[PDB]
């Protein structure tokens, strides 16, 4: 658990930011170049607040699989002058299962917070507010209304982005290497 | 940081509960026998919600030093049939300074959450909403309106109870062994 935590803290300090869209406040993870990821529910507009600064948005892609199934992620390309530290090496080629994970949240209502959630298993397909969603990962999480965007991590791995739960389990969209390029 | 986290998780699972008084929702730490501690601002009444159950309160003591100075803690004795696991061995005889600490929060709006706050130093005397307060500990904490009751911990040590901050530093009341007995 402790190595997962030490990994998550460093990762978050290097690659995360707090974002505000018109739909609420979220944790954002920068991935490489100018591309970051948000849960789909953040619905970024042409402009966002990133760490309380206005940043333009050049492109947003709502991700679906090869047959149009929802993946519940939005990739966004930011008009900034800095690049993100490339972390594509920490993203897996397929859904990750792990014995001990930590969910990290970085928002003005949850500033730098970390939750041990224990074991992660690949759940795959489910309904999420009625919408058929694929490639979900599941773990223990006495759950909230939103507080989503969290980043799901274990030692040396970035697993996914927290997109919701049922009150007893939490669900993350698997964050796969091939989404990027 | 990681050993601090592993310590805090075990400690919280064994000795903490979520409390609701009429003044809000707080993290509570059970200490031994039937005695727990809350920040002074929780103002427990004759009854509390502990993990969503009504529990009676037999005695509440607002702690002050030998010359009546505020310490910002309330010790409360609960009418329950279980004893708390004794953790007086983890409380220090005097204010603790540490290089790496973790603040742990257990509430229905922050369920099992942990914040690395880095170094803790003994601040001693300060004003806290205008009230002269002693035996404060200080650490890094991009701060909130309440979300106090948090437990401040490092590897093998329970340092204090989070009682407020200024926006850049967070403050905990030192939780001293001799308060108990």
From TrEMBL, chains A, B:
<keyword id="KW-0645">Protease</keyword>
<keyword id="KW-1143">T=pseudo3 icosahedral capsid protein</keyword>
<keyword id="KW-1035">Host cytoplasm</keyword>
<keyword id="KW-0460">Magnesium</keyword>
<dbReference type="GO" id="GO:0004197">
    <property type="term" value="F:cysteine-type endopeptidase activity"/>
</dbReference>
<keyword id="KW-0694">RNA-binding</keyword>
<comment type="similarity">
    <text>Belongs to the picornaviruses polyprotein family.</text>
</comment>
<dbReference type="GO" id="GO:0003723">
    <property type="term" value="F:RNA binding"/>
</dbReference>
<dbReference type="GO" id="GO:0019062">
    <property type="term" value="P:virion attachment to host cell"/>
</dbReference>
<dbReference type="GO" id="GO:0030430">
    <property type="term" value="C:host cell cytoplasm"/>
</dbReference>
<keyword id="KW-0548">Nucleotidyltransferase</keyword>
<dbReference type="GO" id="GO:0003968">
    <property type="term" value="F:RNA-directed RNA polymerase activity"/>
</dbReference>
<dbReference type="GO" id="GO:0000166">
    <property type="term" value="F:nucleotide binding"/>
</dbReference>
<keyword id="KW-1160">Virus entry into host cell</keyword>
<dbReference type="GO" id="GO:0039618">
    <property type="term" value="C:T=pseudo3 icosahedral viral capsid"/>
</dbReference>
<keyword id="KW-0808">Transferase</keyword>
<keyword id="KW-0378">Hydrolase</keyword>
<keyword id="KW-0597">Phosphoprotein</keyword>
<keyword id="KW-0547">Nucleotide-binding</keyword>
<comment type="subunit">
    <text>Interacts with RNA-directed RNA polymerase.</text>
</comment>
<keyword id="KW-1161">Viral attachment to host cell</keyword>
<dbReference type="GO" id="GO:0006508">
    <property type="term" value="P:proteolysis"/>
</dbReference>
<keyword id="KW-0945">Host-virus interaction</keyword>
<keyword id="KW-0191">Covalent protein-RNA linkage</keyword>
<keyword id="KW-0946">Virion</keyword>
<dbReference type="GO" id="GO:0046718">
    <property type="term" value="P:symbiont entry into host cell"/>
</dbReference>
<protein>
    <recommendedName>
        <fullName>Genome polyprotein</fullName>
    </recommendedName>
</protein>
<keyword id="KW-0696">RNA-directed RNA polymerase</keyword>
<keyword id="KW-0167">Capsid protein</keyword>
<feature type="domain" description="Peptidase C3">
    <location>
        <begin position="2"/>
        <end position="180"/>
    </location>
</feature>
<keyword id="KW-0788">Thiol protease</keyword>
């Amino acid at each position: 658990m402790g190595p997962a935590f030490e990994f998550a803290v460093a990762m978050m300090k290097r690659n995360s930011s707090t974002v505000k869209t018109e739909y609420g406040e979220f944790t954002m993870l920068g991935i490489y170049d100018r591309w970051a990821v948000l849960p789909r529910h953040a619905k970024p507009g042409p402009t966002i607040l990133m760490n309380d600064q206005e940043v333009g948005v050049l492109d947003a892609k709502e991700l679906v699989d090869k047959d149009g199934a929802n993946l519940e992620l939005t990739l966004l390309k930011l008009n900034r002058n800095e690049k993100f530290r490339d972390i594509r090496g920490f993203l897996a080629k397929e859904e990750v299962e792990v014995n001990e994970a930590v969910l990290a949240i970085n928002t003005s209502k949850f500033p730098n917070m970390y939750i041990p959630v224990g074991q992660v298993t690949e759940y795959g397909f489910l309904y999420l507010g009625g919408t058929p969603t694929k490639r979900m990962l599941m773990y223990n999480f006495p759950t909230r209304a939103g507080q989503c965007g969290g980043v799901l991590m274990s030692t040396g791995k970035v697993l996914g982005i927290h997109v919701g739960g049922n009150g007893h389990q939490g669900f993350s969209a698997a964050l796969l290497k091939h989404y990027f390029n």
